Symmetry: D2
């Protein structure tokens, strides 16, 4: 078995999935859905990697020739994972290994690093994905609930995935490279619990803004992301579910400034209009940010897998943004709602809901981008 470091595979012979920064060796795998794809001959292939964690252990999934093969947790330390063995030596196999767990904002210990491969065969040219999609979202885009029984409720890694996920289903159907940028419970303006700090726009611009602390800083997570190096055809923004929820949740005491925050509902039962306007402003500002870093991308706000109540607030944001900016490449697309037969665990979208949403999103993108 030859050993080849990940950074010593020429670009035509590896697809790196997910946002990368300056660190090439070993390769930090920052986001859910991030990882590597290679095409190799030979009988045997191993990946050498390193992980660390405490409460939230790492999970990875494996696909060979586009088909789901394996999924498992990895506990802290050095690992040598066998990706395949005893295979016919002359046949090339396409191998994709990716992270199942989202980046963890409040967990500075959790990491996954790819070092290299042990192999008896040769690396071949990988498929080239000219089509690129970025997905920005909350627990739905982290695939929380995509595994696990209906009544399971523990907030732990085994229930989250990129392997059963509307975003990766969509990218696969369209033969597209994809980036996932997501955080469970977070909104465009505030988290479901009224936590104003927990908004996606605040972490969007760094390599991985959701990877904090000195270790992640050494990994290059807190540097500004090189947007010019990876420009998506479309940016799918699945946010708002948590912003809606906050209106019905208790006030949040912010330990960083001592102030309390609450999205208010009137004695009328209706949402406080000033508070809706905070979401609208957050949407205008985030769309501005997205456009600044992605000059040519079609921005598509795609929302509805867990209710559609923020439809009008979202489109108010898009409309006000596009008028002021003269931006003709921002759209709204409603995703299908998760029904009783289609829930996974955590009262979240199950695999069938993810599938339903992907079918509709793929149809929309085929027509919008002319990807027939």
């Amino acid at each position: 078995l030859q050993y080849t470091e990940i950074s010593n595979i020429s670009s035509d012979k590896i697809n790196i999935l997910g946002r990368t920064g300056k660190k090439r060796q070993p390769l930090p795998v920052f986001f859910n859905g991030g990882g590597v794809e290679v095409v190799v001959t030979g009988s045997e292939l191993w990946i050498d990697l390193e992980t660390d964690s405490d409460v939230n252990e790492m999970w990875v999934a494996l696909e060979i020739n586009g088909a789901f093969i394996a999924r498992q947790m990895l506990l802290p330390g050095e690992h040598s994972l066998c990706l395949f063995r005893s295979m016919e030596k002359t046949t090339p196999k396409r191998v994709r290994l990716y992270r199942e767990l989202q980046a963890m904002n409040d967990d500075p210990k959790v990491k996954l690093l790819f070092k290299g491969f042990k192999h008896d065969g040769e690396f071949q040219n990988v498929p080239v994905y000219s089509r690129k999609l970025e997905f920005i979202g909350d627990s739905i885009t982290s695939g929380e609930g995509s595994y696990g029984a209906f009544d399971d409720v523990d907030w732990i890694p085994m229930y989250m995935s990129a392997s059963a996920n509307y975003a990766t289903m969509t990218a696969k159907a369209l033969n597209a490279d994809y980036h996932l940028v997501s955080q469970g419970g977070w909104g465009v303006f505030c988290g479901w619990d009224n936590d104003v700090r927990h908004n996606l726009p605040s972490v969007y611009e760094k390599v991985c803004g959701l990877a904090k602390g000195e270790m992640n800083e050494e990994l290059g997570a807190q540097e500004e992301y090189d947007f010019a190096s990876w420009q998506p055809d479309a940016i799918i923004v699945n946010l708002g579910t948590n912003d809606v929820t906050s209106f019905n949740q208790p006030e949040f005491l912010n330990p960083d400034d001592g102030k309390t925050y609450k999205m208010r509902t009137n004695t009328d039962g209706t949402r406080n209009r000033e508070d809706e306007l905070k979401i609208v402003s957050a949407i205008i500002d985030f769309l501005t940010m997205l456009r600044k870093h992605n000059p040519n991308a079609q921005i598509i706000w795609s929302y509805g897998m867990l209710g559609s109540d923020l439809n009008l607030v979202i489109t108010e944001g898009i409309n006000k943004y596009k008028e002021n900016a003269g931006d003709e490449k921002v759209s709204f697309f409603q995703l299908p709602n998760t029904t009783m037969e289609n829930f996974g665990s955590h009262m979240a979208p199950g695999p069938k809901s993810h599938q339903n949403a992907a079918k509709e999103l793929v149809d929309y993108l085929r027509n919008k981008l002319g990807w027939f």
Copy 2:
């Protein structure tokens, strides 16, 4: 066989479906989906009715105990249609006979009048539908393309229906009374061919604004509708498809004022903003009209079965209206797009597309109105 005129069946023993005016005997059936439901014992039931037409003949459909049984054309004259025969005399049968064809704005001859029933059994109490839904739309709500082969293109009655139609599927699922108000090719502001006269708001307030001419005037179609007599829980507005289309269609020379009308697109390929604003205004004005006549209804703009490109212009209208009016009972719900496997005739939604849209709309209404 006893004869009972339609107006001589007590209200607890008949459900009249669709908008009615001053004329009660015989009963004019102005709209698609309009007609009657009774429940009768006996071996045999006939309905006596009158129809007239020229180019566009009448079509009706029959359902017994909720199940589709028959569909046929009716040519001009008096008819006696046998609804059932040779049945067990003691068992009650629920019988629903309704019009498959939309009102025809440009056809003053077409009509359908229900006179009475011939029956050996007795009329029983009918189901009571406290739930009420109004649907306002274009050819989709007229069910154009719901029947016929994929490649059929002739613009004739046989391809239209209430029998295979998302609106009636939705009402049936929710145990609701329904009214359909629809016209193929028409928009909220203009027809697909830029015909500014062809807008639904212009015909909304009359008993049947789309039934014009001397004969229809005698039927009471051009009198103002008594909205207080039938107040819906929700109003589903499926308009905009034809408004978007007009942007890519040649100018329209209006014979009523000699002026030409054209929804313009820039050399940019983008829609003329001033013309978009005309649609926004028409939407604001129409929502005002809807609220005036329906003070308590949840108004739900439901659009997307044939593309969703007007999503933002529609929601701009809804948002500006609701801000100025202080109206908290207006919503937007995007319907699923018709995909290649789901077209009917005329490149319009087939039965499967209607089914998919109904599934999503029913789910939406259950949550919105608390109809679990």
Copy 3:
């Protein structure tokens, strides 16, 4: 104005007659469910002139244009001119299929449907040539009894029967095949559901329409022997056995024709009397012999299971014993999917979804069996 063309004056190239026909050409008697005509015509307008008669059991028909369901209606006794299409674009051809929704009625000597001619402003064009041909033999499932109507409906009347929503015509359509339907609700391979030994399909198989009886039907030519040589199917689908199974759990039957009572017995533990099972086995062997005699080259396929699969072993016993003796390598068994609680129509019979499921599995089978990809 519209031209009038008598049905018998349309050249064989410009009309497809669906279903078994006999000596009578003008007017054309339509004997069986799924029977009728297909033409392809230009013009704006098309009518069919026909005659029907009936008493308790009124005629039903259904109309398909360019392969799509359009209409379905009752027809009461007398002369009719039915408008099939109107106000259409004159230059474009339309394929028009009008067929009978109601089975032949064994006990009813009055019910009939006769096609006389077409009124048309356009021209008849050449019709599809169906080299593929399928015969379906069965009971109420093949009569599509329950394919229309609500779950709780029980009245044994015509409106609930169809060829328009029917696994057999679904199968024929998917495969681009001409089809013949020969069916009778409640009948078995050996006896009816009610133990009536007279109500068996093989007994009526050989005549033009053995199920059309009495003097009126005799003059229409129904009781003459059918000319099997004129229409040879690639496969014969035999959906029988459901009623034979049921008879074991039904009261004895007094036969008014011989005064004998007949009863398929169950043993005290609840299983079928073996000797009575053997009677069904014999009936199957004999029917397979009859089928092979009139159809020397057809693939015979016993297709059963839409309302339970309990007779599986008895059916295959009949097929195996028949085949071993005859050296017939063109007889097969294929199990159809059972109707589940979500897929019943009226009369607790297969609804449209069950018919669809069965047709899907049957179409797959036939493609592989016959080389019809």
Copy 4:
């Protein structure tokens, strides 16, 4: 501190052992695909200590928590401590099922999987009592070969086989039933797909695990006769015949054990040699006798058709001949739905959707046959 509890030290009411077991209790050998253990435990954390060995064909396991698929992975030789869950809410019980994905391997004396015990901070609670019991006997279909992997994949290796995506475990799960899987890819009721006459399921049925050979397996207790009285199924599902039919189209086999060549012959007209069919018929009769001997009360259901139905008449001939000769009223035939082009997995075998479809039909059948509504 996590408690360690040896598997043999858990009271029988607090553990469900899935799959055939023999004399060896500590550690527990898991012989068959679908075999493993189920416990219900509180606590934040659970590990299983196990040992595996293998050469060419490495072990695969799958994990389900509260009836839901969670994980699947290979296991290379040695002792392992596999964490089944962690960081969970301490007071809530979790049902945990860990089972073997890989079939018994007839020609591989090294491959094994032994369960040693659990590490746990919580307590074992009483497990579900499965009164319902189903045995499945079959070939690669019952081994779930092709249930994972891409369409064009052909390598005959463990990663493509499963009990996690398998019509048998799907059926058992839907019916709240304990299950035993006894299967071997390529094997028939009479001979292997390659005419190998030694490769037949009946020859390995009677031992604890006849497919676990060699000294290592002999020590694990695999070659002792199975204690059938200790686990009596309500029904035995026999999915065999696919490889028997295939052999007719395959080259002759030189048997290295006796020096003779074996060939199921096909006639020049293209049909199967009858004498050779009769060998399958006899094999079926003998096997049903074997099944009845060790399972005097079980409903035996031959369930066949996921990869073609060409042997159905030969199978039912075997069943009918057995049934009449023995007076056995509790043997049935049920045809499973064929895998279509959209539903293939790897190896041109049934993919997950086909397994699902087959389970749907089989579950309906079993609900009706056994009264499990």
